[PDB]
Amino acid sequence: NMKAFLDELKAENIKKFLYNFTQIPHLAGTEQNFQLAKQIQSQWKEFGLDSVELAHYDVLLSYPNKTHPNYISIINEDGNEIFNTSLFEPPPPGYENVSDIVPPFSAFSPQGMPEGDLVYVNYARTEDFFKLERDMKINCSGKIVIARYGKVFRGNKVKNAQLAGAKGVILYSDPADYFAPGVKSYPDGWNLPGGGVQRGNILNLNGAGDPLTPGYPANEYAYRRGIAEAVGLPSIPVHPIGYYDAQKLLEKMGGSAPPDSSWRGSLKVPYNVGPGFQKVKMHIHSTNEVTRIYNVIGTLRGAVEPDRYVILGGHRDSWVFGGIDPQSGAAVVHEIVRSFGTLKKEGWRPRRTILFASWDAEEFGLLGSTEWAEENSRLLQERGVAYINADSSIEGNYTLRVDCTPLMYSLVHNLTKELKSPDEGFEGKSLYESWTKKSPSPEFSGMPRISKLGSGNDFEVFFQRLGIASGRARYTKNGYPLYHSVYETYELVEKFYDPMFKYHLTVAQVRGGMVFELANSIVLPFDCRDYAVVLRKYADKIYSISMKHPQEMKTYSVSFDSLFSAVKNFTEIASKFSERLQDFDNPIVLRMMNDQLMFLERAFIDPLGLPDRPFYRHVIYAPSSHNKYAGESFPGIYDALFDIESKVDPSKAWGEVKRQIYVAAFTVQAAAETLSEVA
Amino acid sequence: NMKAFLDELKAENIKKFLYNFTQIPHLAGTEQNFQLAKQIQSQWKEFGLDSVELAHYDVLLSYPNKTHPNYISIINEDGNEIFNTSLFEPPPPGYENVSDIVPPFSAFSPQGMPEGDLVYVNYARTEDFFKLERDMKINCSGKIVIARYGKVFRGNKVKNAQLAGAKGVILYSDPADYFAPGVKSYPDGWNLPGGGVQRGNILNLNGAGDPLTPGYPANEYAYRRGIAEAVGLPSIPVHPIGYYDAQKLLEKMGGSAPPDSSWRGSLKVPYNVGPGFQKVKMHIHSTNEVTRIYNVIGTLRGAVEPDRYVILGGHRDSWVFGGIDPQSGAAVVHEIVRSFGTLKKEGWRPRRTILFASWDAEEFGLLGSTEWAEENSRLLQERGVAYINADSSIEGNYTLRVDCTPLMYSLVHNLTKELKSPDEGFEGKSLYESWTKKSPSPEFSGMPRISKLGSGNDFEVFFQRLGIASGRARYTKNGYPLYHSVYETYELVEKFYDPMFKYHLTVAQVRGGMVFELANSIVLPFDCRDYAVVLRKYADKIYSISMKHPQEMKTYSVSFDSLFSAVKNFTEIASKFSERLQDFDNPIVLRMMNDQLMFLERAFIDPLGLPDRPFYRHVIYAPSSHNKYAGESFPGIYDALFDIESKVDPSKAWGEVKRQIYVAAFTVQAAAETLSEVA
Ligand SMILES: *[C@@H]1O[C@H](CO)[C@@H](O[C@@H]2O[C@H](CO)[C@@H](O[C@@H]3O[C@H](CO)[C@@H](O)[C@H](O[C@H]4O[C@H](CO)[C@@H](O)[C@H](O)[C@@H]4O)[C@@H]3O)[C@H](O)[C@H]2NC(C)=O)[C@H](O)[C@H]1NC(C)=O
Ligand SMILES: *[C@@H]1O[C@H](CO)[C@@H](O[C@@H]2O[C@H](CO)[C@@H](O[C@@H]3O[C@H](CO)[C@@H](O)[C@H](O[C@H]4O[C@H](CO)[C@@H](O)[C@H](O)[C@@H]4O)[C@@H]3O)[C@H](O)[C@H]2NC(C)=O)[C@H](O)[C@H]1NC(C)=O
Ligand SMILES: *[C@@H]1O[C@H](CO)[C@@H](O[C@@H]2O[C@H](CO)[C@@H](O)[C@H](O)[C@H]2NC(C)=O)[C@H](O)[C@H]1NC(C)=O
Ligand SMILES: *[C@@H]1O[C@H](CO)[C@@H](O[C@@H]2O[C@H](CO)[C@@H](O)[C@H](O)[C@H]2NC(C)=O)[C@H](O)[C@H]1NC(C)=O
Ligand SMILES: *[C@@H]1O[C@H](CO)[C@@H](O[C@@H]2O[C@H](CO)[C@@H](O)[C@H](O)[C@H]2NC(C)=O)[C@H](O)[C@H]1NC(C)=O
Ligand SMILES: *[C@@H]1O[C@H](CO)[C@@H](O[C@@H]2O[C@H](CO)[C@@H](O)[C@H](O)[C@H]2NC(C)=O)[C@H](O)[C@H]1NC(C)=O
Ligand SMILES: *[C@@H]1O[C@H](CO)[C@@H](O)[C@H](O)[C@H]1NC(C)=O
Ligand SMILES: *[C@@H]1O[C@H](CO)[C@@H](O)[C@H](O)[C@H]1NC(C)=O
Ligand SMILES: *[C@@H]1O[C@H](CO)[C@@H](O)[C@H](O)[C@H]1NC(C)=O
Ligand SMILES: *[C@@H]1O[C@H](CO)[C@@H](O)[C@H](O)[C@H]1NC(C)=O
Ligand SMILES: *[C@@H]1O[C@H](CO)[C@@H](O)[C@H](O)[C@H]1NC(C)=O
Ligand SMILES: *[C@@H]1O[C@H](CO)[C@@H](O)[C@H](O)[C@H]1NC(C)=O
Ligand SMILES: N[C@@H](CCC(=O)O)C(=O)O
Ligand SMILES: N[C@@H](CCC(=O)O)C(=O)O
Ligand SMILES: [Ca+2]
Ligand SMILES: [Ca+2]
Ligand SMILES: [Cl-]
Ligand SMILES: [Cl-]
Ligand SMILES: [Zn+2]
Ligand SMILES: [Zn+2]
Ligand SMILES: [Zn+2]
Ligand SMILES: [Zn+2]
């Protein structure tokens, strides 16, 4: 049973694995990450899984030219390079003989050497550019943005800069965002040093996966698009830097003052917006190449319903050592596997099949999970019960953070009531109790906050494309300063985040317990009434956004009646379905009603996808078009409404709002009807 | 059991229903067809079904203007109308007081009054236009085609004419195609009189359904496209005529002689190609309007697997009386229903649920079946076992004609061995025996011909869009002369086609028996090895077509290795799966293996659809792009190869051939892998 599963999980084992996974870098496409794949595969076999395979793909990756390094310069009137940005981050104590630390770079930047005047765009959010071009009338065409990291996924910043006419982008970490007050830089605390730099990709893939093979797995015979028809590439060069290098570029900034204090970081600088101050010159030399990646897929066959899959997955590739991101998730998955395999060795099997995955190339655009899911989509869509992600277990040590589909709200509520809080001041009390005192829902009542799933991690294809119920759980802060830098080490974790490994252990219990229950409970632990509740809230919300335009709603006859009508029927049919679920015995009726619960998330998929994003097919949730990390509810209506006052042809824009209301109402009705009696 | 089902079916009942369904016209969108819907619904209730509902939709239909009739004219130098074509067909004996016989028209023609010179294009097939523009260098721009009916779906002719620059199309029935030697015109035989005219729509919908709501059901709150963004409308006027009116238009034809004898009909005319001879003028005045249609859906709940649906469906709407098309199919469905409901009344239930449908508006583009399937797609795709169509039971009286997915080849083989042939000279012998002596397969061996499913009938959405295994069966000739004319009456059927109603009865046994077996057999009666066999044949075929371009295949490295490799694995995995299907007991393993058989057809669906035809998603079969009625195998590769010697950029054209090989190979592999062990 479950308690046996949970008691077998040990903090010491997690620590031991984390140490083992973080001694060398494990960058996607390198031999070191292949070797770790082979190790994971051996150990998952010894741990007891029925099978463990490597699935490999040849996908577009991106690396810096080892002999022609990337950097940024200030240049004078005569073209001499008076300031050069660092070529590498200062390696942390004791790691100075590690080879193959990839220098800071923006994966997938095109090559180029643009010169021009700087403009400072704050976080390069959609609204930051709105402030620039609309209020301040500053024009970014032919300019070079600098933008600080924070708030939104860096791909969105680059996209916004492109559309504003920019010819390059420089990203940097501002200490207002990445330097927490009163704690020391690494190695003496967990803050970002001025030489530290955040790596990461800058693609705008919108669920496509490998940019060369959208729709189809990048296997041995795959037909690849030419690089110019590739999906999601930036067309301007991009490079990130630390805040020491950034102070040098920002201190000379002229032109307009910052519009208000929310544009000002905490470097001792004016934070003028520009343009200009001498010029800035980018040197970027990174190549794209097709490179083999390896997913490890472990199978633990179910005893009764082996054709029903519960998937626990997270990535293995890291930018550098991956002490938090991802090896603190991976070390948790490893111990979960060990523990399931221990039960299995004593003759136990879960009722449903469990798949365990170590994904590759997540850092480069979720490529490993996506290619695999493109290869196995027919299996996943007819047999896929649930996907639980397993990236970083900790990004802080304050409380639990859970993002999931409404179908798992009750499962998570119940599970955390049975678990001991690891928090200081809640010993004896339940994880539910600490989590809900520390992070209460705004949306009602005596309950913990659970957020919407956006994207930016490996659950994306499973949820947004295929409609498999998904969740994720980790310990969070009240990203983190050392995110995607060389300073993310084992030492960072043991010394400053989780010395006892008890937050790790709690996350392993939450992740492992969700999976256990999904794989073993007789009736699937999904509550469809939870979907009914949030659908009303999302419909109230999208309605209020529309009601900011009362005249247009009158003129174009914009009714939401059909959506509220669908949400009411969903509520009603969902009640009747839960009554039936309580009142029945009989392996056919059980299978039928489980298939209804399993397919309910599936019912929200529209095979035509959302407008211009064919691979985002969930009608209720999609990643925000302005921030891949954030989920948006009723995304088709929300985007049809966004900035609608600026459109040229209002009747066409409002026509499209109404079309999206119709699609959402139809889809909510049709979802509901999957829970009606079947005949 | 089955024999009980079959013995309850009576020829007299079929005759009785046919008579009842053919006394007045039942045109889609008229009150008469609504009344027949209500009648069907009452009777299916009295016959015993658990429920019977009307599902209605508001769809774009097309009617002639009652006060401004459509016609064609010859006009002289001064614009006087010297010949006018008939306004109506001479009504048959005894029906001259029937009101609301819709005059001949081409449903969905736009309005217009074009004048110009005639050009004669034979059947207006793709190759006919190739002969015109390529060999004979005749140019159809600003001209008016006339084309005879035959060979290909009339929508394709209109499309071909449009792309050739034509400004109007006149369709007519040539006696070489619609006047069988040695039999008399109606009412004294079954031939087309010179005043008879073939109605029918001329849309190019490619699976879209209602032209205003592609993707989504045309329900009460549907957002409709404007008519100018509508799907599949012709942009030139079209009108059909009989061969008396056609002789008048053809006799004066000048310009080039016909290129050979296959362009010559059997009117005593030269069959000159034109252009010119005086001019031709079209008067077309038909409107498009949104009109309510009604499907009747009957449910017979399954006793064990009520969440698994076997669907028997056919249309109810007719152009006029619908004596063959469709009421001879509908009268068969009615008796099948009666007969199932009789068993039900004696306490029996089928194992799986059976749905019975009387579709509306099939004649206008398969709109009734498609809208319903767009509304219920989530149900159909997770629960849909099979669809059997039930249009015209007879189009002749020579032998059986069966088109179906390979998955039903063995079911149909077995079923027809248990049925008595109704043929003259095969009394005592089996339907299998007559069918295979009369119509032997070219493709191998001692077996009857079974054709590929194309489209042009209500199975389209179920098979080509949703991937539900489908079939159809009817008696055929060695279309038929009176197709879609006023002369298609009950009398036509009783006097000349099937006086005893024994061909009807045989078709009711074949249709009803297929459904019985699908709904009641413990293991689904699908043989996946049958798919393996035809996949090799289709891959040999597509390969041979490519090998007509050996140089290009060398230059661009066009390999089919991946496809043959996928077909071999499918063959192998399909053998192993059938071994397992024989060797097992246990309601879970049974359900699992049935789900594997049910989803196998589903596995061939590509959610991105075929290029430019998003609603044709089956990778193995699609309607021919040159003839909606004909199925084409590996349609994505075949269309990438079609007329490839004429493309401007050969490396791009051959690039697209290879991409399609990759899609087909991936899809065959992925389909196969759904039949592998599940964990
Ligand atoms: C939520 O669930 C309910 C089911 O309880 C469902 O209600 C349906 O609403 C539609 C109207 O929106 C109803 O449509 C009617 O159907 C009848 C036949 O039974 C027609 O005669 C009616 O048509 C006339 O009136 C229209 C409206 O003014 C006219 O425009 C039209 O031209 C006709 O004159 C009418 O269309 C439907 O019957 C009910 N079903 C019920 C009550 O069982 C509702 O739609 C669901 N919500 C969503 C978004 O799906
Ligand atoms: C039909 O079924 C069979 C399964 O029985 C399946 O065979 C697979 O074929 C591919 C090759 O097309 C194999 O790929 C290999 O994988 C190994 C790892 O196990 C690699 O080391 C190999 O890579 C090297 O060689 C390549 C080819 O020259 C190089 O291009 C590459 O860069 C490497 O140097 C190789 O890729 C795969 O392992 C087998 N699986 C087996 C035999 O189990 C076949 O693909 C199926 N057909 C289709 C269309 O799916
Ligand atoms: C991580 O742990 C594994 C196994 O516990 C270590 O890999 C083993 O290393 C020993 C000594 O070289 C060998 O006997 C085995 O062949 C290895 N097992 C494998 C690959 O499965 C691995 O060295 C540890 N990594 C580090 C850096 O400490
Ligand atoms: C979470 O736990 C609650 C309380 O145990 C569960 O709700 C009860 O479930 C039982 C078992 O079916 C019902 O008889 C009770 O009537 C339910 N009570 C309440 C308060 O609703 C709930 O089902 C659990 N959720 C899961 C496991 O998904
Ligand atoms: C077709 O058959 C049906 C029923 O067998 C006939 O409809 C019935 O007509 C009688 C006499 O008018 C009434 O008592 C019933 O109300 C009708 N039943 C219905 C609508 O279900 C129908 O008239 C026949 N049609 C023709 C043209 O013969
Ligand atoms: C059609 O009938 C043939 C002959 O009865 C069936 O094939 C046999 O099926 C039985 C029952 O499972 C097997 O034990 C035999 O070995 C099969 N024999 C042959 C010649 O293959 C076939 O399964 C039937 N097809 C259906 C009902 O789909
Ligand atoms: C790295 O830089 C130099 C200069 O262009 C050259 O040797 C080599 O082509 C580069 N490597 C690449 C493009 O991968
Ligand atoms: C920047 O680097 C370039 C190329 O190596 C060099 O010419 C220049 O001197 C450098 N500038 C400084 C200040 O070091
Ligand atoms: C973890 O522990 C303490 C407890 O509040 C906290 O103050 C400290 O900042 C935390 N560590 C990190 C890295 O957030
Ligand atoms: C039928 O024709 C006449 C002339 O245009 C007119 O009375 C009426 O508008 C027409 N009906 C239509 C367009 O439905
Ligand atoms: C054709 O019909 C028109 C309109 O009714 C009329 O003016 C003309 O006379 C007709 N031609 C003949 C030959 O009847
Ligand atoms: C039906 O019966 C006879 C038998 O051969 C045939 O000659 C006749 O042409 C058939 N009827 C039709 C309409 O095809
Ligand atoms: N999690 C990685 C990848 C995100 C993505 O490519 O969507 C990041 O946030 O950088
Ligand atoms: N069966 C009808 C309709 C075909 C279609 O619209 O596809 C015909 O052939 O006219
Ligand atoms: Ca891909
Ligand atoms: Ca529609
Ligand atoms: Cl996660
Ligand atoms: Cl048919
Ligand atoms: Zn990560
Ligand atoms: Zn990361
Ligand atoms: Zn028909
Ligand atoms: Zn027809």
Q: Is there a contact between B360 and B295 (Cβ–Cβ < 8 Å)?
A: yes
Residue A568 CB contacts under 8 Å (≥ 6 apart), including other chains? none
The token duo for A652 is: 């066409």
| Distance of alpha carbon A224 from alpha carbon A226, whole angstroms | 6
Is A382 within 8 Å of B602 when comparing Cβ atoms?
Answer: yes
Same domain? B325 vs B442: yes
Closest-CA residue in chain A for B669? A375
The HSE-up count of residue B612 (CA atoms within 13 Å, CB side) is 8
Same domain? B573 vs B646: yes
Closest-CA residue in chain B for A379? B674
Phi, psi (deg, nearest 5) at residue A234: -55, 145
Kindly state if the Cβ of B322 falls inside 6 Å of ligand 14. no
Q: Does B299 touch chain A (CB under 8 A)?
A: yes
The whole domain housing B499 covers 1-64+285-525
Taking the CA of A38 as reference, the closest ligand is: 3
Q: Does B650 touch chain A (CB under 8 A)?
A: no
Interface A-B, measured as beta-carbon pairs within 8 A, has a size of: 118
Of B216, B301, B665, the CB nearest to A221: B665
Of B222, B379, B607, the CB nearest to A674: B379
Kindly state if the Cβ of B628 falls inside 6 Å of ligand 14. yes
- To 5 degrees, how large is the angle CA B350–CA B356–CA B357? 170
User: What 3-state DSSP class applies to A672?
Assistant: helix
Site to substitute for ligand 9 among A489, A496, A498, most atoms within 8 A of C-beta: A496
Question: Is the Cα torsion angle B566, B567, B571, B574 positive or negative in sign?
Answer: positive
Across B144-264, the runs of DSSP E, i.e. the strands, are 144-148, 168-172, 200-201, 238-241
Breaks, C-N > 2.5 A, in chain A lie after 277, 478, 585
Token pair 């949104």 is found at B290
Category of B255 on φ-ψ map: left (φ > 0), alpha (ψ -120 to 50) or beta: left
User: What 3-state DSSP class applies to B364?
Assistant: helix
| Distance of alpha carbon A519 from alpha carbon B631, whole angstroms | 43
Boundary-marking domain end, from A284, A300, A317: A284
Is A588 within 8 Å of B592 when comparing Cβ atoms?
Answer: no
Across A195-236, the runs of DSSP E, i.e. the strands, are 200-201
Phi, psi (deg, nearest 5) at residue A397: -140, 20
| Distance of alpha carbon B233 from alpha carbon B237, whole angstroms | 10
State CA A388 to chain mean position distance: 13
Which technique was the structure solved with, according to the deposited record?
X-ray
Instruction: Say whether A89 is catalytic.
Output: no
The HSE-up count of residue B549 (CA atoms within 13 Å, CB side) is 21
- Give Rg (Cα) of chain A: 25
Same domain? B298 vs B441: yes
Report the b/e string of B313-333 with b at 16+ CB within 10 A.
bbbbbbbbbbbbbbbbbbbbb
CATH number at residue A150: 3.50.30.30
Of A223, A307, A587, the CB nearest to B678: A307
To the nearest whole Å, the CA of A603 is away from the closest chain B CA by 6
Which ranges of B547-586 does DSSP label H, i.e. alpha helix? 550-555, 561-582
Same domain? A82 vs A57: no
Is A588 within 8 Å of B305 when comparing Cβ atoms?
Answer: yes
Q: How far does chain A reach from its first CA to its final CA, in angstroms?
A: 36
**Integer CA distances (angstroms), B64 to A669, A675, B83, B106, B367, in order:** 37, 44, 21, 9, 19
To the nearest whole Å, the CA of B662 is away from the closest chain A CA by 6
Is A670 within 8 Å of B377 when comparing Cβ atoms?
Answer: yes
Beta-bridged to residue B200, according to DSSP, are B106
Same domain? B520 vs B638: no
Token pair 């999957």 is found at A674
Across A460-560, the runs of DSSP E, i.e. the strands, are 469-476
| Distance of alpha carbon B542 from alpha carbon B74, whole angstroms | 47
Cβ count near A555 (within 10 Å): 12
Q: Are strands A352-359 and A287-300 parallel, antiparallel or unpaired?
A: antiparallel
| Distance of alpha carbon A614 from alpha carbon A608, whole angstroms | 6
CATH number at residue B633: 1.20.930.40
Is B378 within 8 Å of A674 when comparing Cβ atoms?
Answer: yes
Kindly state if the Cβ of B42 falls inside 6 Å of ligand 5. yes
Is B587 within 8 Å of A587 when comparing Cβ atoms?
Answer: yes
Beta-bridged to residue A400, according to DSSP, are A475
Which ranges of A223-376 does DSSP label H, i.e. alpha helix? 243-250, 327-345, 367-375
Residue type, A202: I
Q: Is there a contact between B294 and B34 (Cβ–Cβ < 8 Å)?
A: yes
| Distance of alpha carbon A502 from alpha carbon A328, whole angstroms | 12
Residue type, B53: E
The token duo for B175 is: 């006696």
**Integer CA distances (angstroms), B271 to B121, B252, B611, in order:** 10, 10, 38
Q: Is there a contact between B472 and B403 (Cβ–Cβ < 8 Å)?
A: yes
The token duo for A560 is: 């939401």
Residue nearest to atom 6 of ligand 14 (CA): B365
Q: Are strands B399-404 and B469-476 parallel, antiparallel or unpaired?
A: antiparallel
Q: Which position among B115, B433, B595, B606 bears the catalytic label? A: B595
The token duo for A350 is: 């879960």
Closest-CA residue in chain B for A304? B588
**Integer CA distances (angstroms), B575 to A225, B2, B523, B562, B579, in order:** 36, 29, 16, 20, 6
Give the length of chain B.
Answer: 679
Residue type, B563: L
- Closest of B595, B620, B583 to residue B605, by C-alpha: B620
Q: B-chain residues within 8 Å CB-CB of A636?
A: none
Question: Is the Cα torsion angle A126, A132, A136, A137 positive or negative in sign?
Answer: negative
Residue type, A481: P
**Integer CA distances (angstroms), B103 to A191, B25, B185, in order:** 83, 12, 20
CATH number at residue A483: 3.40.630.10
| Distance of alpha carbon A674 from alpha carbon B48, whole angstroms | 25
Of A50, A221, A679, the CB nearest to B562: A221
Residue type, B150: G
Cβ count near B456 (within 10 Å): 19
Same domain? B258 vs B113: yes
Same domain? A498 vs A611: no
Residue nearest to atom 7 of ligand 13 (CA): A456
User: What 3-state DSSP class applies to A387?
Assistant: strand
Q: Is there a contact between A537 and A365 (Cβ–Cβ < 8 Å)?
A: no
User: What 3-state DSSP class applies to B428?
Assistant: coil
Beta-bridged to residue A191, according to DSSP, are A185
Residue B512 CB contacts under 8 Å (≥ 6 apart), including other chains? B5, B6, B9, B312, B332, B336, B339, B340
- Give Rg (Cα) of chain B: 25
State CA A679 to chain mean position distance: 40
Residue A3 CB contacts under 8 Å (≥ 6 apart), including other chains? none
Q: Which position among A283, A285, A334, A618 bears the catalytic label? A: A618
The token duo for B470 is: 């489908």
- Closest of B186, B57, B607, B245 to residue A614, by C-alpha: B607
Judged by CB atoms within 8 Å, which residues 337-396 of B form the interface with A? 353, 375-379, 382-383
The token duo for A378 is: 């027919």
Q: Does B309 touch chain A (CB under 8 A)?
A: yes
Q: How far is the centre of ligand 21, averaged over its atoms, from the C-alpha of B330 (Å)? A: 10
Same domain? A265 vs A344: no
Taking the CA of A480 as reference, the closest ligand is: 9
Q: Is there a contact between A337 and A88 (Cβ–Cβ < 8 Å)?
A: no
Number of domains in chain B: 3
| Distance of alpha carbon A542 from alpha carbon A669, whole angstroms | 17
Q: Does A495 touch chain B (CB under 8 A)?
A: no
Residue nearest to atom 13 of ligand 3 (CA): A39
Specified resolution (Å): 2.2
Report the b/e string of A269-283 with b at 16+ CB within 10 A.
bebbbbbbbebbbbb
| Distance of alpha carbon B157 from alpha carbon A513, whole angstroms | 63
| Distance of alpha carbon A189 from alpha carbon A183, whole angstroms | 6
Top residue of A356, A588, A602, A677 to mutate, by most chain B CBs within 10 Å, is A588
Same domain? A276 vs A359: no
Closest-CA residue in chain B for A380? B674
Helix (H) or strand (E) holding A55: strand A51-63
Boundary-marking domain end, from A284, A306, A337: A284
- To 5 degrees, how large is the angle CA A213–CA A214–CA A216? 70
Burial of A134 (0-12, 13-18, 19+ CB in 10 A): exposed
Which ranges of A263-383 does DSSP label H, i.e. alpha helix? 327-345, 367-375, 377-383
Question: Is the Cα torsion angle A60, A63, A66, A72 positive or negative in sign?
Answer: positive
In the DSSP assignment, the letter for residue A362 is: G
Torsion (CA) B85, B88, B93, B95 in degrees, nearest 10: 180
Q: What is the side-by-side strand order in the sheet with B115-116?
A: B81-84, B71-75, B279-283, B115-116
Which ranges of B376-470 does DSSP label H, i.e. alpha helix? 377-383, 409-417, 431-438, 460
Report the b/e string of B28-51 with b at 16+ CB within 10 A.
bbbeebbebbeebbebbeebbbbe
Taking the CA of B663 as reference, the closest ligand is: 2
Judged by CB atoms within 8 Å, which residues 196-225 of A form the interface with B? 215-217, 219, 221-223
Beta-bridged to residue B299, according to DSSP, are B51, B355
Q: Is there a contact between A391 and A384 (Cβ–Cβ < 8 Å)?
A: no
Q: Is there a contact between A384 and A505 (Cβ–Cβ < 8 Å)?
A: no
- To 5 degrees, how large is the angle CA B438–CA B505–CA B325? 85
State CA B558 to chain mean position distance: 34
| Distance of alpha carbon A580 from alpha carbon A613, whole angstroms | 38
User: What 3-state DSSP class applies to A618?
Assistant: strand
Across A581-676, the runs of DSSP E, i.e. the strands, are 621-624, 627-633
The token duo for B180 is: 């069988």
| Distance of alpha carbon B354 from alpha carbon B44, whole angstroms | 13
Q: Is there a contact between A393 and A348 (Cβ–Cβ < 8 Å)?
A: no
What crossing angle do the helices spanning A327-345 and A502-520 adopt, rounded to 10°? 50
Same domain? B549 vs B628: yes
| Distance of alpha carbon A605 from alpha carbon A623, whole angstroms | 14
The token duo for B260 is: 């050979």
Same domain? B232 vs B318: no
Burial of B77 (0-12, 13-18, 19+ CB in 10 A): exposed
Q: Is there a contact between A146 and A170 (Cβ–Cβ < 8 Å)?
A: yes
- Closest of B603, B567, B560 to residue B405, by C-alpha: B603
State CA B585 to chain mean position distance: 40
Beta-bridged to residue A171, according to DSSP, are A147, A240
Q: Does A75 touch chain B (CB under 8 A)?
A: no
- To 5 degrees, how large is the angle CA A308–CA A313–CA A314? 170
Is A353 within 8 Å of B50 when comparing Cβ atoms?
Answer: no
| Distance of alpha carbon A529 from alpha carbon A572, whole angstroms | 9
The token duo for B427 is: 């009394």
| Distance of alpha carbon A533 from alpha carbon A406, whole angstroms | 9
Q: Are strands B51-63 and B287-300 parallel, antiparallel or unpaired?
A: antiparallel
Kindly state if the Cβ of A527 falls inside 6 Å of ligand 4. yes
Boundary-marking domain end, from A220, A250, A284: A284
Of B306, B595, B670, the CB nearest to A678: B306
Across A576-626, the runs of DSSP E, i.e. the strands, are 621-624
Nearest ligand 5 atom, CA B43: 21
Q: B-chain residues within 8 Å CB-CB of A376?
A: 670, 673
Top residue of B53, B210, B216, B597 to mutate, by most chain A CBs within 10 Å, is B216
| Distance of alpha carbon A312 from alpha carbon A5, whole angstroms | 15
Q: Are strands A238-241 and A287-300 parallel, antiparallel or unpaired?
A: unpaired
Residue type, B351: R
| Distance of alpha carbon A407 from alpha carbon A125, whole angstroms | 32
Same domain? B42 vs B132: no
The token duo for A521 is: 């409970």
